[PDB]
């Protein structure tokens, strides 16, 4: 297993690309109907930033959930101690890009449960090999990671 | 509803030490690093360093090594800028600012707290 | 070497209805790691654009970024009287992270 680099994306095309996590469907509020297609995440080996204090973070895709899980477990194996940290997961407060796959929750931002920056590339790689359709060293602070739509 | 309260305006000798502080509501204060800024006409803006409260770890500009410690009380979600040593060129507003997780830039900023060296 | 950011202009006199154009090059590669925040007379800076285009929550239409690598534009694409400011870049590709010397938006009328 070998590190992504800062900055560097897997698979190598855009996010929105059919080879990677495929085209935004469209904003998911509280509201829709769509919101129901959303669950939340309770894997009690997963931290929920959940600075907003909504549970937002937890709510995600089927899919989504699924290679989060597989990275929970490949993250306490690689670091003994250590858990996989959501920062943010569906978005309601505009805080990404303005047609981020959070928004229809279908990614996370993670890192690991010590805030050690010097693991967040092998995080990465983890993601990679946990499943995740895109991943994407997008910060100092941060790994970004999307999914395919269930459609 | 986030907020960065700064301790009030200082005069201090030069070679004498000065203490400032800011104080954070409106989050859960180790969720969050607090970083220290400069302002001044001479340097426009400078990154002094970074106090990550959960941790207690910090990082210094090496250009304020010697001029500058970071410290945090949790309990009463307060961080403190302690400077040494002063001269004139460390007249300024200085900054406390929050960042979001999202890399080393600063969506809440303290009001600032302007120290005047003098004698 | 730390990296400087050299901003340009230092002033715009400007219209309201007009477009501003400030830019900000890097001593070396920053990837997208280029911020922008805006500074009103008085008041401490507020950040508008972050990843050199991304706008932050609540942040008008009219301010945009782009760039990548050592040389990002900033553009208020009609200024309002209201943004009168000096505006900042800062990079934090590299550590420390470092500001631009800033561009003063001045009103026209």
């Known amino acids: 297993l070998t590190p992504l680099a800062y900055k560097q994306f897997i698979p190598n095309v855009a996010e929105k690309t059919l080879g990677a996590s495929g085209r935004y469907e469209g904003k998911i509020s509280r509201n829709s109907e769509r919101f129901k297609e959303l669950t939340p995440n309770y894997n009690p080996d997963i931290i929920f930033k959940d600075e907003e204090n909504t549970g937002a973070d937890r709510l995600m895709t089927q899919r989504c959930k699924d290679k989060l899980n597989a990275l929970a477990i490949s993250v306490m194996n690689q670091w003994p101690g250590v858990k996989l940290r959501v920062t943010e997961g569906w978005d309601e407060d505009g805080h990404h890009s303005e047609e981020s796959l959070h928004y229809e929750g279908r990614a996370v931002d993670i890192t690991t449960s010590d805030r050690d920056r010097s693991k967040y590339g092998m995080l990465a790689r983890l993601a990679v090999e946990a499943g995740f359709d895109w991943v994407y060293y997008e910060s100092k602070a941060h790994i970004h990671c999307s999914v395919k739509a269930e459609n | 509803q986030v907020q960065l309260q700064q301790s009030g305006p200082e005069l201090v000798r030069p070679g004498v030490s000065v203490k400032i502080s800011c104080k954070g509501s409106?989050?859960?204060?180790?969720?969050?690093?607090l970083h220290w800024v400069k302002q001044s006409h001479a340097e426009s803006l400078e990154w002094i360093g970074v106090i990550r409260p959960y941790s207690g770890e910090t990082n210094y500009n090496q250009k304020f090594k010697d001029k500058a410690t970071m410290t945090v009380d949790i309990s009463s979600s307060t961080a403190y800028l302690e400077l040494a040593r002063l001269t004139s060129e460390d007249s300024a507003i200085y900054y406390c600012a929050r960042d979001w997780e999202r890399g080393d830039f600063f969506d809440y900023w303290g009001q600032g707290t302007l120290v005047t060296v003098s004698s | 070497g730390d990296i400087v950011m050299t901003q340009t202009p230092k002033f715009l006199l400007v219209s309201a209805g007009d477009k501003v154009t400030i830019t900000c090059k890097a001593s070396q590669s920053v990837s997208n790691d280029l911020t922008w925040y805006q500074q009103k007379p008085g008041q401490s800076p507020k950040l508008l654009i972050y990843?050199?285009?991304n706008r932050y929550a609540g942040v008008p239409d009219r301010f945009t970024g782009s760039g990548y690598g050592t040389d990002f534009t900033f553009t208020i694409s009609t200024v309002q009287a209201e943004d009168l400011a000096v505006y900042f870049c800062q990079q934090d590709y590299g550590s420390p992270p470092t500001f631009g010397g800033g561009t003063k938006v001045e009103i026209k009328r």
């Open positions: 409106g989050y859960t204060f180790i969720d969050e690093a």
């Open positions: 990843y050199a285009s």
